[PDB]
Design a protein around this ligand. Structure first.
Ligand SMILES: CCCOc1cc2c(cc1/C(C)=C/C=C/C(C)=C/C(=O)O)C(C)(C)CCC2(C)C
Ligand SMILES: CCCOc1cc2c(cc1/C(C)=C/C=C/C(C)=C/C(=O)O)C(C)(C)CCC2(C)C
Lengths: 10, 249, 239, 11
Protein backbone atom coordinates (compact mmCIF):
# COMPACT_ATOMS: atom_id res chain seq x y z
CA UNK A 1 0.00 0.00 0.00
CA UNK A 2 2.81 2.41 -0.95
CA UNK A 3 0.44 5.11 -2.27
CA UNK A 4 -2.09 4.90 0.57
CA UNK A 5 0.62 4.94 3.25
CA UNK A 6 2.08 8.04 1.60
CA UNK A 7 -1.26 9.87 1.36
CA UNK A 8 -1.95 9.03 5.02
CA UNK A 9 1.40 10.20 6.36
CA UNK A 10 1.34 13.28 4.07
CA UNK B 1 -39.74 38.69 5.25
CA UNK B 2 -41.93 37.50 8.15
CA UNK B 3 -41.90 33.88 9.31
CA UNK B 4 -45.52 33.19 10.33
CA UNK B 5 -46.33 31.40 13.58
CA UNK B 6 -46.69 27.65 13.23
CA UNK B 7 -47.97 25.24 15.86
CA UNK B 8 -46.15 23.28 18.56
CA UNK B 9 -42.68 24.68 17.96
CA UNK B 10 -40.18 21.87 18.43
CA UNK B 11 -38.07 21.68 21.60
CA UNK B 12 -34.61 20.11 21.67
CA UNK B 13 -31.92 19.71 24.30
CA UNK B 14 -28.41 21.16 24.23
CA UNK B 15 -26.11 18.98 22.17
CA UNK B 16 -23.27 21.46 21.74
CA UNK B 17 -20.43 18.95 21.41
CA UNK B 18 -22.31 16.85 18.87
CA UNK B 19 -23.37 20.07 17.12
CA UNK B 20 -19.71 20.94 16.51
CA UNK B 21 -18.83 17.42 15.39
CA UNK B 22 -21.81 17.56 13.04
CA UNK B 23 -20.52 20.83 11.63
CA UNK B 24 -17.01 19.41 11.16
CA UNK B 25 -18.31 16.34 9.30
CA UNK B 26 -20.47 18.56 7.09
CA UNK B 27 -17.58 20.86 6.16
CA UNK B 28 -15.23 17.93 5.56
CA UNK B 29 -17.75 16.39 3.16
CA UNK B 30 -18.49 19.66 1.35
CA UNK B 31 -14.82 20.55 1.01
CA UNK B 32 -13.90 17.12 -0.43
CA UNK B 33 -16.97 16.68 -2.64
CA UNK B 34 -18.66 19.55 -4.49
CA UNK B 35 -22.42 19.54 -4.78
CA UNK B 36 -24.41 19.19 -7.99
CA UNK B 37 -25.54 22.82 -7.81
CA UNK B 38 -21.93 24.05 -7.71
CA UNK B 39 -20.79 21.87 -10.65
CA UNK B 40 -20.80 23.01 -14.27
CA UNK B 41 -22.11 20.05 -16.23
CA UNK B 42 -20.97 18.79 -19.61
CA UNK B 43 -21.71 15.65 -21.62
CA UNK B 44 -19.84 13.53 -24.08
CA UNK B 45 -21.39 11.78 -27.05
CA UNK B 46 -19.24 8.63 -26.73
CA UNK B 47 -21.50 5.55 -26.91
CA UNK B 48 -24.57 7.32 -25.53
CA UNK B 49 -26.80 5.37 -27.95
CA UNK B 50 -26.44 1.73 -26.88
CA UNK B 51 -24.80 -0.54 -24.32
CA UNK B 52 -21.38 -1.96 -25.22
CA UNK B 53 -18.89 -4.27 -23.50
CA UNK B 54 -16.68 -1.36 -22.38
CA UNK B 55 -16.20 2.08 -23.90
CA UNK B 56 -12.42 2.01 -23.62
CA UNK B 57 -12.58 5.79 -24.08
CA UNK B 58 -15.02 6.42 -21.24
CA UNK B 59 -13.08 4.09 -18.97
CA UNK B 60 -9.96 6.29 -19.12
CA UNK B 61 -11.93 9.29 -17.88
CA UNK B 62 -13.91 7.30 -15.30
CA UNK B 63 -10.84 5.62 -13.79
CA UNK B 64 -8.91 8.90 -13.57
CA UNK B 65 -11.88 10.61 -11.90
CA UNK B 66 -12.10 7.56 -9.64
CA UNK B 67 -8.42 7.98 -8.76
CA UNK B 68 -9.02 11.62 -7.86
CA UNK B 69 -12.08 10.88 -5.71
CA UNK B 70 -10.18 8.19 -3.77
CA UNK B 71 -7.69 10.95 -2.96
CA UNK B 72 -10.58 13.16 -1.80
CA UNK B 73 -11.91 10.33 0.38
CA UNK B 74 -8.52 9.96 2.06
CA UNK B 75 -8.60 13.72 2.69
CA UNK B 76 -12.14 13.45 4.09
CA UNK B 77 -11.05 10.59 6.35
CA UNK B 78 -8.12 12.59 7.72
CA UNK B 79 -10.54 15.36 8.70
CA UNK B 80 -12.84 13.18 10.77
CA UNK B 81 -11.92 13.79 14.44
CA UNK B 82 -9.67 11.06 15.79
CA UNK B 83 -9.13 9.17 12.52
CA UNK B 84 -5.48 10.13 12.35
CA UNK B 85 -5.18 9.13 16.01
CA UNK B 86 -5.53 5.50 14.89
CA UNK B 87 -2.50 3.51 13.78
CA UNK B 88 -1.62 3.79 10.10
CA UNK B 89 -2.47 0.10 9.69
CA UNK B 90 -6.03 0.66 10.98
CA UNK B 91 -6.44 3.81 8.88
CA UNK B 92 -5.52 1.75 5.82
CA UNK B 93 -7.77 -1.13 6.85
CA UNK B 94 -10.72 1.22 7.38
CA UNK B 95 -10.24 3.03 4.05
CA UNK B 96 -9.75 -0.17 2.02
CA UNK B 97 -12.90 -1.62 3.59
CA UNK B 98 -15.14 1.38 2.98
CA UNK B 99 -13.74 3.15 -0.08
CA UNK B 100 -16.02 1.64 -2.70
CA UNK B 101 -19.02 1.98 -0.36
CA UNK B 102 -18.41 5.73 0.08
CA UNK B 103 -17.69 6.22 -3.60
CA UNK B 104 -21.03 4.63 -4.49
CA UNK B 105 -22.78 6.83 -1.96
CA UNK B 106 -21.06 9.92 -3.36
CA UNK B 107 -21.85 9.27 -7.02
CA UNK B 108 -25.48 8.46 -6.15
CA UNK B 109 -25.84 11.88 -4.55
CA UNK B 110 -25.00 13.24 -8.02
CA UNK B 111 -28.02 11.59 -9.65
CA UNK B 112 -30.32 13.81 -11.76
CA UNK B 113 -33.54 11.73 -11.92
CA UNK B 114 -35.26 13.57 -14.80
CA UNK B 115 -32.20 13.12 -17.06
CA UNK B 116 -31.28 9.66 -15.68
CA UNK B 117 -27.67 10.78 -15.25
CA UNK B 118 -24.83 10.91 -12.78
CA UNK B 119 -22.33 13.75 -12.58
CA UNK B 120 -18.67 13.48 -11.66
CA UNK B 121 -16.62 16.03 -9.75
CA UNK B 122 -15.29 17.72 -12.92
CA UNK B 123 -18.86 18.15 -14.19
CA UNK B 124 -18.85 15.14 -16.53
CA UNK B 125 -22.44 13.91 -16.83
CA UNK B 126 -23.18 10.43 -18.19
CA UNK B 127 -26.58 8.86 -18.82
CA UNK B 128 -27.34 5.31 -17.69
CA UNK B 129 -26.04 3.58 -20.81
CA UNK B 130 -22.82 5.60 -20.69
CA UNK B 131 -22.33 4.71 -17.02
CA UNK B 132 -22.70 1.11 -18.13
CA UNK B 133 -20.16 1.52 -20.94
CA UNK B 134 -17.73 3.34 -18.62
CA UNK B 135 -17.21 0.23 -16.50
CA UNK B 136 -20.34 -0.22 -14.40
CA UNK B 137 -21.41 -3.08 -16.67
CA UNK B 138 -23.83 -5.43 -14.91
CA UNK B 139 -23.90 -3.18 -11.82
CA UNK B 140 -25.35 -0.13 -13.61
CA UNK B 141 -28.99 -0.92 -12.85
CA UNK B 142 -28.13 -1.77 -9.22
CA UNK B 143 -26.32 1.55 -8.69
CA UNK B 144 -28.99 3.57 -10.50
CA UNK B 145 -31.66 1.83 -8.44
CA UNK B 146 -29.85 2.67 -5.22
CA UNK B 147 -29.61 6.29 -6.38
CA UNK B 148 -33.36 6.36 -6.96
CA UNK B 149 -34.03 4.77 -3.57
CA UNK B 150 -32.03 7.56 -1.92
CA UNK B 151 -34.15 10.41 -3.35
CA UNK B 152 -37.17 10.00 -0.99
CA UNK B 153 -34.81 10.35 2.00
CA UNK B 154 -33.87 13.84 0.74
CA UNK B 155 -30.46 13.64 2.38
CA UNK B 156 -28.27 16.74 2.53
CA UNK B 157 -24.52 17.19 2.89
CA UNK B 158 -24.56 16.74 6.68
CA UNK B 159 -26.36 13.41 6.53
CA UNK B 160 -24.27 12.28 3.56
CA UNK B 161 -21.04 13.15 5.35
CA UNK B 162 -22.19 11.56 8.61
CA UNK B 163 -23.21 8.39 6.79
CA UNK B 164 -19.83 8.25 5.03
CA UNK B 165 -18.02 8.77 8.34
CA UNK B 166 -20.03 5.95 9.93
CA UNK B 167 -19.28 3.64 7.02
CA UNK B 168 -15.53 4.32 7.32
CA UNK B 169 -15.13 4.38 11.11
CA UNK B 170 -16.42 0.83 11.68
CA UNK B 171 -14.94 -1.35 14.44
CA UNK B 172 -16.18 -4.54 12.74
CA UNK B 173 -13.60 -4.55 9.94
CA UNK B 174 -11.43 -7.63 10.02
CA UNK B 175 -7.73 -7.22 10.94
CA UNK B 176 -8.10 -4.00 12.96
CA UNK B 177 -5.42 -3.46 15.60
CA UNK B 178 -7.53 -1.33 18.00
CA UNK B 179 -11.13 -2.16 17.05
CA UNK B 180 -12.47 -0.86 20.37
CA UNK B 181 -10.95 2.59 19.78
CA UNK B 182 -12.61 2.67 16.35
CA UNK B 183 -15.91 1.75 18.04
CA UNK B 184 -15.51 4.77 20.35
CA UNK B 185 -14.97 7.08 17.42
CA UNK B 186 -18.10 5.74 15.75
CA UNK B 187 -20.48 6.20 18.70
CA UNK B 188 -20.71 10.03 18.57
CA UNK B 189 -21.08 9.77 14.76
CA UNK B 190 -24.17 7.60 15.24
CA UNK B 191 -25.48 10.03 17.88
CA UNK B 192 -24.90 13.16 15.79
CA UNK B 193 -26.71 11.56 12.86
CA UNK B 194 -29.64 10.58 15.04
CA UNK B 195 -29.96 14.06 16.54
CA UNK B 196 -29.53 15.82 13.20
CA UNK B 197 -32.27 13.68 11.63
CA UNK B 198 -34.56 14.45 14.58
CA UNK B 199 -33.93 18.19 14.31
CA UNK B 200 -34.31 18.38 10.53
CA UNK B 201 -37.25 15.97 10.10
CA UNK B 202 -39.29 16.40 13.31
CA UNK B 203 -42.39 14.98 11.57
CA UNK B 204 -40.78 11.69 10.40
CA UNK B 205 -39.44 9.59 13.33
CA UNK B 206 -38.37 6.30 11.57
CA UNK B 207 -35.80 8.13 9.44
CA UNK B 208 -32.73 7.23 11.52
CA UNK B 209 -32.95 3.43 11.06
CA UNK B 210 -34.16 3.90 7.47
CA UNK B 211 -31.05 5.94 6.61
CA UNK B 212 -28.81 3.57 8.57
CA UNK B 213 -30.09 0.63 6.54
CA UNK B 214 -28.72 2.29 3.38
CA UNK B 215 -25.24 1.22 4.48
CA UNK B 216 -26.44 -2.40 4.31
CA UNK B 217 -27.50 -1.72 0.70
CA UNK B 218 -24.13 -0.13 -0.12
CA UNK B 219 -22.29 -3.23 1.09
CA UNK B 220 -24.52 -5.41 -1.07
CA UNK B 221 -23.31 -3.39 -4.09
CA UNK B 222 -19.62 -2.88 -3.32
CA UNK B 223 -19.45 -6.62 -2.57
CA UNK B 224 -20.01 -7.13 -6.30
CA UNK B 225 -17.53 -4.38 -7.19
CA UNK B 226 -14.68 -6.73 -6.41
CA UNK B 227 -15.90 -9.25 -8.99
CA UNK B 228 -16.02 -6.41 -11.53
CA UNK B 229 -12.42 -5.33 -10.86
CA UNK B 230 -11.39 -8.75 -12.14
CA UNK B 231 -13.65 -8.57 -15.18
CA UNK B 232 -12.33 -5.10 -16.02
CA UNK B 233 -8.69 -6.18 -15.57
CA UNK B 234 -9.14 -8.52 -18.57
CA UNK B 235 -10.86 -5.99 -20.84
CA UNK B 236 -8.55 -3.03 -20.41
CA UNK B 237 -5.15 -2.93 -22.11
CA UNK B 238 -2.42 -2.59 -19.60
CA UNK B 239 -2.87 -2.00 -15.91
CA UNK B 240 -5.55 -0.79 -13.55
CA UNK B 241 -4.69 2.62 -12.01
CA UNK B 242 -2.53 1.71 -9.03
CA UNK B 243 -4.48 3.55 -6.33
CA UNK B 244 -7.65 1.75 -7.42
CA UNK B 245 -5.81 -1.57 -7.04
CA UNK B 246 -4.59 -0.65 -3.55
CA UNK B 247 -8.19 0.07 -2.52
CA UNK B 248 -9.55 -3.17 -4.06
CA UNK B 249 -6.80 -5.60 -2.98
CA UNK C 1 -52.39 1.16 27.52
CA UNK C 2 -50.73 3.34 24.91
CA UNK C 3 -51.77 2.11 21.51
CA UNK C 4 -48.54 1.75 19.55
CA UNK C 5 -46.81 0.09 22.50
CA UNK C 6 -49.64 -2.43 22.59
CA UNK C 7 -49.44 -3.06 18.83
CA UNK C 8 -45.66 -3.35 18.80
CA UNK C 9 -45.67 -5.86 21.67
CA UNK C 10 -48.28 -7.85 19.75
CA UNK C 11 -46.01 -7.73 16.70
CA UNK C 12 -42.86 -8.56 18.70
CA UNK C 13 -44.58 -11.56 20.27
CA UNK C 14 -45.86 -13.18 17.11
CA UNK C 15 -42.48 -12.77 15.41
CA UNK C 16 -40.66 -14.43 18.31
CA UNK C 17 -43.24 -17.23 18.15
CA UNK C 18 -42.94 -17.52 14.35
CA UNK C 19 -39.17 -17.87 14.60
CA UNK C 20 -39.38 -20.32 17.50
CA UNK C 21 -41.86 -22.67 15.87
CA UNK C 22 -39.91 -22.67 12.58
CA UNK C 23 -36.34 -22.86 13.93
CA UNK C 24 -35.45 -25.07 16.92
CA UNK C 25 -32.94 -23.65 19.34
CA UNK C 26 -29.49 -25.11 19.89
CA UNK C 27 -30.25 -26.33 23.44
CA UNK C 28 -33.31 -28.24 22.17
CA UNK C 29 -31.38 -30.33 19.64
CA UNK C 30 -29.83 -33.72 20.29
CA UNK C 31 -26.44 -33.36 18.66
CA UNK C 32 -24.79 -36.14 16.68
CA UNK C 33 -21.64 -36.11 14.58
CA UNK C 34 -20.34 -37.80 11.46
CA UNK C 35 -16.83 -38.83 10.48
CA UNK C 36 -17.26 -38.02 6.74
CA UNK C 37 -14.04 -36.12 5.68
CA UNK C 38 -13.82 -34.34 9.08
CA UNK C 39 -10.04 -34.00 9.20
CA UNK C 40 -8.87 -32.46 5.91
CA UNK C 41 -10.52 -30.09 3.46
CA UNK C 42 -11.52 -31.43 0.03
CA UNK C 43 -13.07 -29.76 -3.00
CA UNK C 44 -16.41 -31.37 -2.15
CA UNK C 45 -17.69 -34.33 -0.17
CA UNK C 46 -20.71 -35.48 -2.16
CA UNK C 47 -22.26 -37.29 0.81
CA UNK C 48 -22.00 -34.18 2.97
CA UNK C 49 -23.35 -32.01 0.14
CA UNK C 50 -26.36 -34.31 -0.11
CA UNK C 51 -27.14 -34.22 3.61
CA UNK C 52 -26.44 -30.50 3.93
CA UNK C 53 -28.47 -29.40 0.89
CA UNK C 54 -31.31 -31.59 2.11
CA UNK C 55 -31.24 -29.87 5.51
CA UNK C 56 -30.97 -26.47 3.82
CA UNK C 57 -33.99 -27.33 1.66
CA UNK C 58 -35.98 -28.22 4.80
CA UNK C 59 -35.02 -24.98 6.47
CA UNK C 60 -36.06 -22.93 3.41
CA UNK C 61 -39.46 -24.59 3.75
CA UNK C 62 -39.52 -23.38 7.36
CA UNK C 63 -38.42 -19.93 6.22
CA UNK C 64 -41.45 -19.79 3.91
CA UNK C 65 -43.62 -20.81 6.87
CA UNK C 66 -41.96 -18.08 8.96
CA UNK C 67 -42.73 -15.45 6.29
CA UNK C 68 -46.37 -16.48 5.99
CA UNK C 69 -46.66 -15.68 9.71
CA UNK C 70 -45.27 -12.13 9.42
CA UNK C 71 -48.09 -9.54 9.60
CA UNK C 72 -48.95 -8.18 6.17
CA UNK C 73 -46.57 -10.47 4.27
CA UNK C 74 -49.38 -12.34 2.55
CA UNK C 75 -51.04 -8.98 1.77
CA UNK C 76 -48.22 -8.24 -0.65
CA UNK C 77 -48.56 -9.27 -4.28
CA UNK C 78 -47.75 -12.90 -5.05
CA UNK C 79 -44.80 -11.83 -7.19
CA UNK C 80 -43.47 -9.61 -4.39
CA UNK C 81 -43.80 -12.42 -1.84
CA UNK C 82 -41.74 -14.59 -4.21
CA UNK C 83 -39.21 -11.85 -4.97
CA UNK C 84 -38.66 -11.09 -1.26
CA UNK C 85 -38.21 -14.76 -0.31
CA UNK C 86 -35.64 -15.33 -3.06
CA UNK C 87 -33.74 -12.16 -2.17
CA UNK C 88 -33.57 -12.88 1.59
CA UNK C 89 -33.31 -16.69 1.61
CA UNK C 90 -29.55 -16.91 2.05
CA UNK C 91 -29.59 -13.91 4.47
CA UNK C 92 -31.96 -15.74 6.81
CA UNK C 93 -30.23 -19.12 6.34
CA UNK C 94 -26.91 -17.51 7.30
CA UNK C 95 -28.45 -15.81 10.31
CA UNK C 96 -30.09 -19.07 11.42
CA UNK C 97 -26.98 -21.24 11.16
CA UNK C 98 -24.89 -18.67 13.04
CA UNK C 99 -27.25 -18.97 16.01
CA UNK C 100 -26.31 -22.69 15.91
CA UNK C 101 -22.56 -22.20 16.32
CA UNK C 102 -20.72 -23.84 19.20
CA UNK C 103 -17.40 -22.01 19.76
CA UNK C 104 -15.55 -24.60 21.87
CA UNK C 105 -16.20 -27.40 19.38
CA UNK C 106 -16.04 -25.00 16.37
CA UNK C 107 -19.21 -26.60 15.00
CA UNK C 108 -22.57 -25.72 13.53
CA UNK C 109 -25.67 -27.78 14.30
CA UNK C 110 -28.50 -28.42 11.87
CA UNK C 111 -32.17 -28.73 12.77
CA UNK C 112 -31.92 -32.56 12.93
CA UNK C 113 -28.98 -32.36 15.35
CA UNK C 114 -26.25 -32.95 12.77
CA UNK C 115 -23.17 -31.20 14.09
CA UNK C 116 -20.43 -30.53 11.52
CA UNK C 117 -17.00 -29.12 12.24
CA UNK C 118 -15.45 -26.29 10.22
CA UNK C 119 -13.70 -28.63 7.80
CA UNK C 120 -16.89 -30.62 7.21
CA UNK C 121 -18.82 -27.37 6.64
CA UNK C 122 -16.20 -26.54 4.04
CA UNK C 123 -16.48 -29.95 2.39
CA UNK C 124 -20.28 -29.82 2.44
CA UNK C 125 -20.10 -26.88 0.07
CA UNK C 126 -19.13 -23.68 1.95
CA UNK C 127 -15.76 -24.05 0.23
CA UNK C 128 -13.98 -20.68 0.09
CA UNK C 129 -16.70 -18.95 2.11
CA UNK C 130 -16.17 -21.09 5.21
CA UNK C 131 -13.97 -18.86 7.37
CA UNK C 132 -16.09 -15.81 6.52
CA UNK C 133 -19.26 -17.52 7.75
CA UNK C 134 -17.51 -18.88 10.85
CA UNK C 135 -15.96 -15.48 11.59
CA UNK C 136 -19.40 -13.91 11.33
CA UNK C 137 -20.83 -16.51 13.72
CA UNK C 138 -18.16 -15.67 16.29
CA UNK C 139 -18.90 -11.95 16.04
CA UNK C 140 -22.58 -12.56 16.77
CA UNK C 141 -22.11 -14.83 19.79
CA UNK C 142 -21.05 -12.03 22.20
CA UNK C 143 -24.23 -10.08 21.36
CA UNK C 144 -26.22 -13.09 22.65
CA UNK C 145 -29.31 -12.55 20.55
CA UNK C 146 -32.46 -14.36 21.64
CA UNK C 147 -35.35 -15.62 19.48
CA UNK C 148 -37.05 -12.21 19.41
CA UNK C 149 -34.00 -10.41 18.04
CA UNK C 150 -33.25 -13.19 15.54
CA UNK C 151 -36.88 -13.29 14.43
CA UNK C 152 -37.09 -9.51 14.10
CA UNK C 153 -33.79 -9.32 12.23
CA UNK C 154 -34.96 -12.07 9.86
CA UNK C 155 -38.24 -10.25 9.27
CA UNK C 156 -36.39 -7.00 8.62
CA UNK C 157 -34.15 -8.78 6.07
CA UNK C 158 -37.15 -10.37 4.38
CA UNK C 159 -39.48 -7.35 4.30
CA UNK C 160 -37.09 -5.00 2.51
CA UNK C 161 -38.37 -2.31 0.13
CA UNK C 162 -35.06 -2.00 -1.72
CA UNK C 163 -35.09 -5.41 -3.44
CA UNK C 164 -34.97 -5.28 -7.22
CA UNK C 165 -38.20 -5.64 -9.19
CA UNK C 166 -40.80 -5.33 -6.46
CA UNK C 167 -44.20 -4.19 -7.78
CA UNK C 168 -45.16 -2.35 -4.56
CA UNK C 169 -41.82 -1.28 -3.02
CA UNK C 170 -43.52 1.50 -1.03
CA UNK C 171 -46.00 -0.92 0.57
CA UNK C 172 -43.07 -3.15 1.52
CA UNK C 173 -41.12 -0.17 2.83
CA UNK C 174 -44.02 0.76 5.10
CA UNK C 175 -44.40 -2.83 6.32
CA UNK C 176 -40.79 -2.82 7.48
CA UNK C 177 -41.13 0.28 9.65
CA UNK C 178 -42.90 -1.37 12.64
CA UNK C 179 -40.31 -4.18 12.56
CA UNK C 180 -37.53 -1.62 12.96
CA UNK C 181 -39.42 0.16 15.73
CA UNK C 182 -40.17 -3.14 17.50
CA UNK C 183 -36.51 -4.20 17.39
CA UNK C 184 -35.42 -0.84 18.80
CA UNK C 185 -37.83 -0.95 21.73
CA UNK C 186 -36.96 -4.58 22.45
CA UNK C 187 -33.20 -3.98 22.46
CA UNK C 188 -33.59 -1.01 24.79
CA UNK C 189 -35.71 -3.04 27.18
CA UNK C 190 -33.30 -5.99 27.13
CA UNK C 191 -29.91 -4.22 27.07
CA UNK C 192 -30.57 -1.16 29.28
CA UNK C 193 -26.93 -0.45 30.20
CA UNK C 194 -25.87 -0.52 26.53
CA UNK C 195 -26.16 2.75 24.58
CA UNK C 196 -25.98 2.08 20.85
CA UNK C 197 -27.08 -1.56 20.65
CA UNK C 198 -29.89 -0.80 18.19
CA UNK C 199 -27.48 0.51 15.50
CA UNK C 200 -24.89 -2.16 16.36
CA UNK C 201 -27.33 -5.06 16.03
CA UNK C 202 -29.05 -3.51 13.00
CA UNK C 203 -25.89 -2.96 11.00
CA UNK C 204 -25.07 -6.68 11.42
CA UNK C 205 -27.39 -7.00 8.42
CA UNK C 206 -24.60 -5.26 6.50
CA UNK C 207 -22.43 -8.33 7.15
CA UNK C 208 -25.31 -10.65 6.22
CA UNK C 209 -25.80 -8.95 2.85
CA UNK C 210 -22.10 -9.10 2.08
CA UNK C 211 -21.83 -12.80 2.92
CA UNK C 212 -25.05 -13.57 1.12
CA UNK C 213 -23.81 -11.85 -2.03
CA UNK C 214 -20.71 -14.03 -1.85
CA UNK C 215 -22.89 -17.10 -1.31
CA UNK C 216 -24.69 -16.31 -4.56
CA UNK C 217 -21.32 -16.43 -6.35
CA UNK C 218 -20.52 -19.69 -4.56
CA UNK C 219 -23.69 -21.26 -5.98
CA UNK C 220 -22.25 -20.69 -9.47
CA UNK C 221 -18.94 -22.40 -8.75
CA UNK C 222 -20.63 -25.22 -6.82
CA UNK C 223 -22.78 -26.18 -9.81
CA UNK C 224 -19.59 -26.95 -11.72
CA UNK C 225 -18.33 -29.19 -8.91
CA UNK C 226 -21.52 -31.16 -8.11
CA UNK C 227 -22.10 -34.11 -10.53
CA UNK C 228 -25.82 -33.38 -10.54
CA UNK C 229 -28.38 -30.67 -9.97
CA UNK C 230 -29.04 -28.98 -6.67
CA UNK C 231 -32.39 -29.65 -4.96
CA UNK C 232 -35.05 -27.86 -7.03
CA UNK C 233 -36.14 -25.56 -4.22
CA UNK C 234 -32.56 -24.38 -3.86
CA UNK C 235 -32.46 -23.92 -7.65
CA UNK C 236 -35.59 -21.79 -7.45
CA UNK C 237 -34.38 -19.67 -4.53
CA UNK C 238 -30.98 -19.02 -6.10
CA UNK C 239 -32.15 -17.80 -9.53
CA UNK D 1 -40.40 -22.40 -14.32
CA UNK D 2 -40.02 -24.17 -10.97
CA UNK D 3 -43.29 -25.00 -9.17
CA UNK D 4 -42.11 -25.63 -5.59
CA UNK D 5 -42.07 -22.14 -4.05
CA UNK D 6 -45.53 -21.28 -5.37
CA UNK D 7 -46.90 -24.57 -4.05
CA UNK D 8 -45.22 -23.88 -0.69
CA UNK D 9 -46.80 -20.40 -0.56
CA UNK D 10 -50.24 -21.72 -1.42
CA UNK D 11 -49.77 -24.39 1.29
C1 LIG E 1 -12.08 2.00 -5.19
C2 LIG E 1 -12.54 2.76 -6.42
C3 LIG E 1 -14.01 3.11 -6.35
O1 LIG E 1 -14.48 3.76 -7.54
C4 LIG E 1 -15.17 2.97 -8.42
C5 LIG E 1 -14.57 1.86 -8.97
C6 LIG E 1 -15.34 0.87 -9.56
C7 LIG E 1 -16.74 0.99 -9.56
C8 LIG E 1 -17.31 2.21 -9.19
C9 LIG E 1 -16.55 3.18 -8.55
C10 LIG E 1 -17.21 4.41 -8.05
C11 LIG E 1 -18.46 4.25 -7.24
C12 LIG E 1 -16.67 5.61 -8.37
C13 LIG E 1 -17.15 6.91 -8.01
C14 LIG E 1 -16.55 8.03 -8.41
C15 LIG E 1 -16.95 9.39 -8.11
C16 LIG E 1 -17.96 9.62 -7.03
C17 LIG E 1 -16.40 10.35 -8.89
C18 LIG E 1 -16.35 11.81 -8.74
O2 LIG E 1 -16.79 12.44 -7.79
O3 LIG E 1 -15.76 12.38 -9.74
C19 LIG E 1 -17.68 -0.14 -9.99
C20 LIG E 1 -18.59 0.35 -11.12
C21 LIG E 1 -18.58 -0.56 -8.83
C22 LIG E 1 -16.90 -1.36 -10.53
C23 LIG E 1 -15.52 -1.58 -9.92
C24 LIG E 1 -14.62 -0.35 -10.12
C25 LIG E 1 -13.29 -0.55 -9.38
C26 LIG E 1 -14.29 -0.12 -11.59
C1 LIG F 1 -22.37 -18.01 2.24
C2 LIG F 1 -22.49 -19.37 2.91
C3 LIG F 1 -23.72 -19.46 3.76
O1 LIG F 1 -24.14 -20.82 3.98
C4 LIG F 1 -24.88 -21.43 2.99
C5 LIG F 1 -24.38 -21.58 1.72
C6 LIG F 1 -25.12 -22.19 0.72
C7 LIG F 1 -26.41 -22.65 1.01
C8 LIG F 1 -26.94 -22.44 2.28
C9 LIG F 1 -26.17 -21.89 3.31
C10 LIG F 1 -26.71 -21.86 4.69
C11 LIG F 1 -26.52 -20.65 5.56
C12 LIG F 1 -27.43 -22.95 5.08
C13 LIG F 1 -28.20 -23.09 6.29
C14 LIG F 1 -28.91 -24.18 6.62
C15 LIG F 1 -29.69 -24.37 7.82
C16 LIG F 1 -29.90 -23.18 8.71
C17 LIG F 1 -30.08 -25.63 8.10
C18 LIG F 1 -30.80 -26.19 9.28
O2 LIG F 1 -31.25 -25.55 10.21
O3 LIG F 1 -30.94 -27.49 9.21
C19 LIG F 1 -27.27 -23.38 -0.02
C20 LIG F 1 -28.55 -22.58 -0.32
C21 LIG F 1 -27.70 -24.75 0.53
C22 LIG F 1 -26.45 -23.78 -1.25
C23 LIG F 1 -25.48 -22.72 -1.71
C24 LIG F 1 -24.45 -22.33 -0.64
C25 LIG F 1 -23.24 -23.25 -0.53
C26 LIG F 1 -23.91 -20.98 -1.10
Amino acid sequence: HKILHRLLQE
Amino acid sequence: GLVPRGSHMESYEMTAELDDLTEKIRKAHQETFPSLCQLGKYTTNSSADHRVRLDLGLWDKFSELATKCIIKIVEFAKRLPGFTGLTIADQITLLKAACLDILILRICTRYTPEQDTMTFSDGLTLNRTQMHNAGFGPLTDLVFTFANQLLPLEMDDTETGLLSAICLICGDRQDLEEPTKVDKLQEPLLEALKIYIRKRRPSKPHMFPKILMKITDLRSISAKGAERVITLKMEIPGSMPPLIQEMME
